[PDB]
């Protein structure tokens, strides 16, 4: 809430006061204090479908794979994404896992939502969203989702919201061609939309016609490949690009339909989710498998 110049200077000086980097372990063990007592493994049927999860877009970086191929990757963080309730046919008329993520200051939280959070025995949450799933894939209330939910190399269906670009004309909003910059073109026509419909016969402008307006801010879905996961910080590195701002909410779920049939048919997945066994050691960082053939062959 400072002045513009103060915020600019603090942005400039941000780097000088970062915390020292943490020490990332190579292997970790999980005890009963981090495993929900009702979390148990299930073997899926044909109709079984797992739940998604919520993450925050953090940034993007370039990483080398085993062959030396460089991939641009987007880092997302599952910042305390916790199951808060279960939807059921008899109790709610449908089936889903309700998940809360983030932290909101209490002085910004409202009293009834504070009561909900107290009932859930969790800190105040920033956002809450549902994930529809099969009956056998329902997770117990209180379980905390981990990046280990996703096997590296798998395809994931990702949904988000695109950024806002403000008010834009047709040329910038839809890439209209406009007119020539010379040859007698009138000033109003250089970036005009031209004609906008047919003539007296139909006597309308058709719905969904492309015109100027406020650009951006739409729900956008894409596919990504799970490139890497780090369990210590609940970081997931996904190959490609993801809609939204840095710090914006992202839904991540298993690929479906054509993508699943073409990519995920043979990659085993944990059902309902990763179910740790107490006392067993697991790797902290996992990479996707390498390509069989040499990308630099030609």
């Amino acid at each position: 809430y400072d002045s513009r110049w103060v915020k600019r200077l603090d942005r400039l000086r941000e780097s000088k006061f970062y915390d020292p980097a943490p020490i990332i372990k190579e292997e970790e063990i999980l005890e009963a204090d981090k495993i929900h007592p009702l979390l148990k493994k299930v073997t899926p049927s044909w109709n079984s479908r797992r739940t998604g999860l919520l993450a925050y877009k953090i940034g993007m970086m370039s990483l080398w794979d085993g062959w030396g191929e460089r991939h641009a990757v987007t880092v997302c963080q599952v910042d305390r994404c916790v199951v808060m309730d279960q939807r059921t046919l008899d109790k709610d008329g449908y089936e889903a896992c309700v998940m809360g993520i983030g932290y909101k200051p209490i002085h910004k939280v409202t009293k009834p939502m504070l009561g909900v959070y107290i009932r859930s025995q969790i800190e105040p949450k920033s956002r809450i969203a549902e994930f529809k799933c099969s009956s056998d894939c329902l997770l117990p209330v209180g379980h905390e989702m981990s990046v280990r939910h996703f096997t590296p190399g798998q395809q994931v269906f990702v949904s988000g919201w695109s950024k806002d670009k403000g008010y834009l004309g047709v040329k910038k909003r839809w890439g209209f061609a406009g007119q020539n910059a010379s040859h007698g073109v009138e000033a109003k026509a250089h970036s005009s939309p031209g004609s906008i419909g047919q003539s007296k016969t139909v006597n309308v402008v058709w719905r969904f016609k492309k015109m100027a307006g406020h650009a951006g801010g739409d729900p956008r879905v894409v596919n990504c490949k799970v490139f890497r996961i780090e369990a210590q910080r609940n970081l997931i590195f996904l190959k490609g690009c993801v809609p939204g701002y840095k710090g914006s909410l992202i839904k991540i779920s298993d690929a479906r339909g054509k993508t699943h049939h073409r990519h995920n048919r043979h990659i085993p997945l944990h059902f309902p989710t990763f179910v740790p066994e107490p006392g067993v050691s697991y790797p902290v960082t996992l990479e996707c498998p390498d390509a069989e053939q040499d990308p630099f062959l030609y």
Binding site: L89, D90, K91, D92, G93, Y94, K132
Partner: peptide, 15 residues
């Protein structure tokens, strides 16, 4: 992924 009709005779809210 829906039960989208209350005119159906099938398992629903309050079964």
């Amino acid at each position: 992924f829906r039960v989208g009709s209350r005119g159906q005779v099938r398992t629903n809210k309050g079964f």
